[PDB]
Paper text:
The sialic acid transporter of P. mirabilis (SiaT) is a secondary active transporter of the SSS family, which use the Na+ electrochemical gradients as the driving force for the uptake of extracellular substrates. The uropathogen, Proteus mirabilis, catabolises host-derived sialic acids as a source of energy; the genes required for the transport and degradation of sialic acids are encoded within the nan operon. SiaT comprises 13 transmembrane helices (Tm0 and Tm1-Tm12) with the N- and C-termini facing the periplasmic and cytoplasmic spaces, respectively. Homologues of SiaT are found in a wide range of pathogenic bacteria including Streptococcus pneumoniae, S. enterica, Staphylococcus aureus and C. difficile.
Here we report the high-resolution (1.95 Å) substrate-bound outward-open structure and a functional and biophysical characterisation of SiaT. The structure is in complex with the sialic acid N-acetylneuraminic acid (Neu5Ac) and two Na+ ions. The sialic acid binding site is near the centre of the protein, lined by residues from four helices (Tm1-Tm3 and Tm6). The electron density in this site corresponds to Neu5Ac in its β-anomeric form as seen in the Haemophilus influenzae periplasmic binding protein (SiaP) of the sialic acid TRAP system. Tm1 and Tm6 adopt a distorted helical structure within the membrane bilayer at the point of contact with the substrate, which has implications for how binding drives the alternating-access mechanism. The negatively charged carboxylate group of Neu5Ac forms hydrogen bonds to the hydroxyl and amine groups of Ser60 and Thr63 and a salt bridge with the guanidinium of Arg135 (Tm3). One Na+ binds to the conserved Na2 site, whereas the second Na+ binds a new position that we term Na3. One ion occupies the conserved Na2 site, which is located between Tm1 and Tm8 at a prominent kink in Tm119. Na3 is 6.5 Å from Na2, towards the cytoplasm, and ~14 Å from the substrate binding site. At this position, the Na+ is coordinated by the main-chain carbonyl group of Ser342 (Tm8), the hydroxyl groups of Ser345 and Ser346 (Tm8), and by the carboxyl group of Asp182 (Tm5).
Author numbering: 5 to 399, 404 to 488
Amino acid sequence: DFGFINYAVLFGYLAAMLLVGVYFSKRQKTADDYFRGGGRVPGWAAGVSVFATTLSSITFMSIPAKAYTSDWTFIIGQYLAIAILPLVFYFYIPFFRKLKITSAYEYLEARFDVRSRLFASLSFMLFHIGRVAIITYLTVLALRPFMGIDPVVLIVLISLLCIIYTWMGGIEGVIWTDVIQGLLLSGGAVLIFIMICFKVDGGISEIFTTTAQADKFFPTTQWRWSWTDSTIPVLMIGFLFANIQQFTASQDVVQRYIVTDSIKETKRTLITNAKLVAIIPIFFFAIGSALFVYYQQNPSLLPAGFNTGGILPLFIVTEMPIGIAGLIIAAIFAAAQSSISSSLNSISSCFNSDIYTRLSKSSPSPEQKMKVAKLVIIVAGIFSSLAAIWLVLSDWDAFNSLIGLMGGPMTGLFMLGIFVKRANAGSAVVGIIVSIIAVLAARYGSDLNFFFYGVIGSMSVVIAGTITAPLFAPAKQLSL
Ligand SMILES: CCCCCCCCCCCCO[C@@H]1O[C@H](CO)[C@@H](O[C@H]2O[C@H](CO)[C@@H](O)[C@H](O)[C@H]2O)[C@H](O)[C@H]1O
Ligand SMILES: CC(=O)N[C@H]1[C@H]([C@H](O)[C@H](O)CO)O[C@](O)(C(=O)O)C[C@@H]1O
Ligand code: NA
Ligand code: NA
């Protein structure tokens, strides 16, 4: 078994997350508290929270498996995510801040009209219900063979517990848990790397040389155009657009831009996040390369037909010492939970502003907004968790892959509003329609690589919403 000591580390970590939630529950009086944090978050904390929100068990498990089986080409993705940040700061964040947004999609009603706002908000909320279910599913897939408990108990520990502290704690409790979880997964990744270096005969130098000799850093055979394969050009355009989605059009990140009290602290949020993205992800790639060298030096330690997605967890549970092993498991929990908590709170912030407030005939009182803010964390939590239970016990993708395609059009709407002065409500709507059709064509009637779905979706809104602008009444002004 995992053992009592390893467990006690895990349950200490879980108890610490709940206690942070209890601490921040006292200050939740209004929706402003619960979603905007009353302007009490410093920049550095919001920036760690952005990193921990975006980096989930998807990165933690997949990126090492990917470097193990192939190469580091995907890391170009991380650096493109940093490269766009000044553009976000200069062109997007001033609108978000000056409008005193609760939900990012309020910008779309201000720039265009309610149809664009609601299309984007519903696509966000549905996508993130999926992201939570997926994050929870992968974590369970990773840990289940090695914990000695039923999948459902594991879901209680990963998901239910996360729901409780998120519910009590508001965006402040979500952010301060994220800071701990962000730093825990970061040190955890560094510590895994170190340990694998100490177990490879020849250490870090042999890990480097073997990897470079196998052409597993940046193979030039991947510098080629393709419509179907995930080559360097495809993933560069693909990650550029995914990153623009993540940092301009996605409520879980955009929410962190408005919790700081000044633009000075807002810059600190982006700067802190940039430092983490420039340093930490490299360790996840380095881990897959290290493990590859380690299991080439120790061929009999893998069962034949072992799934390469389980090699990292296999190494943790079989090769890391007692206490340390329990802490790495807590760090995988921390990668999952920091993303789950942010997605639940953002889902509730969108529901509160874009659905409940915007569509009520009269404006809800402060006390009413607070109630619904809390309630939607439970409801979304329940739905996300059931889905995760279904994914586990059965062996669905349709809904998820379908709603995922709406990320492109949501992101195009922001690019169009922000950069095309003549675009207007109607031309944005023609843009959505064109975008939707184009993405369904890409996904279901072609063999195009998945990296193209976002670019197509985005650029379809931009192009159709630009060329059809003169057919509708002149654009709303919106002067900041
Ligand atoms: C998915 C692919 C589809 C893309 C095909 C291109 C679609 C382009 C549509 C262009 C026509 C838009 O239709 C829009 O209709 C309203 C009524 O419908 C027009 O009407 C508006 O202006 C006119 C000016 O005379 C007024 O008489 C009218 O009362 C007012 O509402 C808008 O000026 C026009 O902008
Ligand atoms: C460029 C890239 O790989 N982006 C990935 C990011 C980054 O790894 C992370 O934000 C650190 O920069 O993590 C995810 O959002 C995640 O783990 O759920 C998946 C996404 O595909
Ligand atoms: Na996370
Ligand atoms: Na979070």
